[PDB]
Design a binder for these strands. Structure first.
Lengths: 96, 92, 283, 87, 102, 102
DNA sequence: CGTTTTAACCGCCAAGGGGATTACTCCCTAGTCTCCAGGCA
DNA sequence: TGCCTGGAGACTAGGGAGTAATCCCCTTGGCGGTTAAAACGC
């Protein structure tokens, strides 16, 4: 039994907007944080609370940017976000 | 020791809702919010007293600070309550 | 806690602990129950690492600037990052310098012909997992059938591998086993050769892995060799393990030399004469 | 390959496609193009670079070697984005 | 005899006055500024706690969680305007699907 | 004898020291910090005036006007990122033609 | 949506390195008084 | 160009900062096992 595209997407949207679970795994994000911090200073330790706050801030910024680019794409009478949509969102927000 | 605003927020909650409790995470969030508002109002009053070449932070400075930071209704009621508190502090 | 960790004092504390512990732990030795142990066999063989890693150890430009783990990985074998193969051998195949970059692999190459001629199955216990892949690649280069086991490899395949190993005429003459994953999970009644790799800071699991070669009913003389590098972290780790063993005692490359170490009789030296001649020709 | 697995997966690929998909679904996006992933990965990398640089400067000013939570909180507060629930 | 009881508040007037003194915001601090600041703080805290309790009772929960705080601060437009630049950990986003996507 | 002459800068380190003292930024202030801050300010003003003079010479003018300062700030990407939020009188930013709206 | 794969999460092992502490020292900057020349009208 | 007040020099001291001594807890690195999550294909 298959569903036409769009309904499972809406179900997942509702599920994710209702819950507050983290949409990024802990270990990959922590490894990425450590890799990025290696460029600024080597042999640096990290507390679990630090990487958790980093993950929370990153997810908040990402969902805000995704809402903004969704609004920008809807303004273009489309339902598909594009790289240029995110670029316009970042240019209007000023954090380019 | 380690100072915090936990017991005061808990007492306010029990004085506004006697049944619903509060968790540790929500308590820490409320403490951080209180600290943020406190530092905002303190910096506002400091720069206001500096713009007038004053050196005494008084009720007028904090009143101007809350009128500048808190928008609309959140300001008005607040300052009213503030005035009320001040008057009560003059009672005793 | 104050008195138990004190070990005059060690003698008194041990006397009291024995007086109070006698009804708790039972322990017997193989030489008392069966007396079928052909030898007290235990051997440590030392080796040296190539100058390429000695320079890194002496200078520590990328270490003193994790250090212990990286030093152990370097001492184990090279070619642990893609850049190492890209620089040394861009083909990433089986070629030269595979058995020369480390004394462990030089010893392995020198002793593989004796294991092949003699027919003694060899179990090699490993602490790291990439070293097991490097050993698999080396054994594939040597065209020697071997068994590969590791932790959480497969739920049921371990039983099939154990059944295949237990065959009376199995064509596999070696197997690689993770030290931590051992758990006495294999009854090695058809082998008498043991190789000890990375240093295993816990002597408990080292002794557990070594004891596998002494199952009841074994007819072949057991030979257990531990390959330790010198002038490096491995030697210090071995010394620390020896100190830990001494503490526990209070509570709980020449052809002729390798032949004398590995041979059980003059007939084995006679057989290995051909291996010695081939080694001389290769040198 | 019998010789070696030859796995060189980059650390930036840790955030996988379903993660970005869930993030977009939470953001309210119905259909997502295939080029969004690299763009949002670059944006996340730039944001993390900035925040980590600020936090590293903050923790280095105090001579400490451990990046604590208060350092990241101050780094976020500097950029005009206050985070709650961590100090 | 604590000044909070005299002023009629639940927040520590002495602690607020000490924080104002040792904060180097100025060289002198009056006597009405601490009680006024404590009044504003307790008013804001009472409003937020009342909204969070209402949100939790709507969600048949008797313990306030960060989700309830997020819902209470984002429902009220005033606090949303005040704390618009402030993110809340474990608060998520409010459910809002566009008409063109339904 | 002025300490600025000993340090080698033209900005008055004494004025910066007095401002940091009476500015209520801390309870005590160091002796090298005012010189450091004065040097930073001197370097910043030197860069700004150099870019403004270059812009004026490019526009064939013998004086620096707010237009030249705006052009010098908006041309350099470093100062543009630094001075992005601040607006300057006598505006206008960059003469540029859009290739899509011909 | 399916089928195949595999890395993330909870659980264990070990160690050592900064982040905590407290105690002693010490010299930098806060004054206070006396000149004076760089900055202002 | 002329005038003066903010700036500077000499003396005093005490408290905040630097340095040594102490220790344990949080972190780092690794492995086992399971399985829900990630990858590839139509």
């Amino acid at each position: 039994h298959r569903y036409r595209p769009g309904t499972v997407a809406l179900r997942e949207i509702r599920r994710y907007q209702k819950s507050t679970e983290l949409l990024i795994r802990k270990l990959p994000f922590q490894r990425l944080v450590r890799e990025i911090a290696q460029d600024f200073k080597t042999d640096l330790r990290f507390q679990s609370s630090a990487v958790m706050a980093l993950q929370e801030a990153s997810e908040a910024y990402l969902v805000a940017l995704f809402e903004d680019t969704n609004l920008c794409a809807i303004h273009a009478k489309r339902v598909t976000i594009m790289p240029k949509d995110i670029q316009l969102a970042r240019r209007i927000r000023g954090e380019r | 020791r380690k100072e915090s605003y936990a017991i005061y927020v808990y007492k306010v909650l029990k004085q506004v809702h006697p049944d619903t409790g509060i968790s540790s995470k929500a308590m820490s969030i409320m403490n951080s919010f209180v600290n943020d508002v406190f530092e905002r109002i303190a910096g506002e009053a400091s720069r206001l007293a500096h713009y007038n070449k004053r050196s005494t932070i008084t009720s007028r400075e904090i009143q101007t600070a809350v009128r500048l930071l808190l928008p609309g209704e959140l300001a008005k009621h607040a300052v009213s309550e503030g005035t009320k508190a001040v008057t009560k502090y003059t009672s005793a | 806690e104050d008195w138990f960790n004190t070990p005059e004092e060690t003698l008194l504390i041990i006397r009291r602990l024995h007086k109070v512990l006698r009804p708790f732990l039972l322990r017997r030795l193989k030489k008392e129950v069966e007396k079928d142990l052909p030898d007290k066999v235990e051997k440590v063989i030392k080796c040296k690492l190539s100058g390429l890693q000695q320079q890194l150890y002496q200078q520590m430009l990328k270490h003193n600037a994790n250090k212990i783990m990286q030093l152990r990985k370097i001492c184990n074998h090279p070619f642990v990052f893609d850049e190492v193969e890209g620089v040394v051998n861009p083909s990433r195949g089986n070629s030269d310098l595979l058995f020369r970059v480390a004394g462990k692999f030089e010893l392995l190459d020198r002793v593989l012909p004796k294991f092949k001629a003699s027919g003694h199955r060899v179990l090699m216990f490993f602490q790291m997992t990439q070293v097991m892949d490097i050993m698999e690649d080396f054994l594939r280069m040597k065209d020697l059938k071997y068994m590969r086991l590791d932790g959480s490899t497969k739920t049921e395949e371990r039983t099939e591998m154990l059944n295949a190993f237990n065959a009376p005429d199995s064509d596999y003459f070696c197997f690689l086993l993770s030290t931590r994953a051992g758990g006495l999970g294999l009854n090695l009644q058809t082998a008498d050769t043991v190789i000890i790799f990375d240093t295993d800071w816990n002597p408990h699991q080292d002794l557990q892995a070594q004891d596998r070669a002494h199952r009841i009913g074994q007819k072949n003389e057991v030979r257990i060799l531990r390959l330790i590098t010198t002038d490096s972290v491995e030697e210090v780790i071995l010394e620390r393990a020896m100190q830990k063993l001494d503490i526990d005692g209070k509570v709980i490359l020449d052809d002729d030399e390798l032949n004398d170490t590995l041979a059980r009789s003059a007939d084995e030296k006679i057989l290995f004469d051909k291996i010695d001649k081939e080694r001389m020709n290769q040198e | 390959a019998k010789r070696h697995r030859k796995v060189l997966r980059d650390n930036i690929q840790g955030i996988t496609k379903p993660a970005i998909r869930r993030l977009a679904r939470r953001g309210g996006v119905k259909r997502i193009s295939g080029l969004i992933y690299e763009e949002t990965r670059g944006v996340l990398k730039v944001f993390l670079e900035n925040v980590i640089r600020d936090a590293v400067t903050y923790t280095e000013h105090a001579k400490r070697k451990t990046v604590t939570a208060m350092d990241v909180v101050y780094a976020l507060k500097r950029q005009g984005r206050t985070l709650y629930g961590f100090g | 005899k604590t000044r909070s009881s005299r002023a009629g508040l639940q927040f520590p007037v002495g602690r607020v006055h000490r924080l104002l003194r040792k904060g180097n915001y100025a060289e002198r601090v009056g006597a009405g500024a601490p009680v006024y600041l404590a009044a504003v703080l307790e008013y804001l805290t009472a409003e937020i706690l009342e909204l969070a309790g209402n949100a939790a009772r709507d969600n048949k929960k008797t313990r306030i969680i960060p989700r309830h705080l997020q819902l209470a601060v984002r429902n009220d437009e005033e606090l949303n305007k005040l704390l618009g630049r402030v993110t809340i950990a474990q608060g998520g986003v409010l459910p809002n699907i566009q008409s063109v996507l339904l």
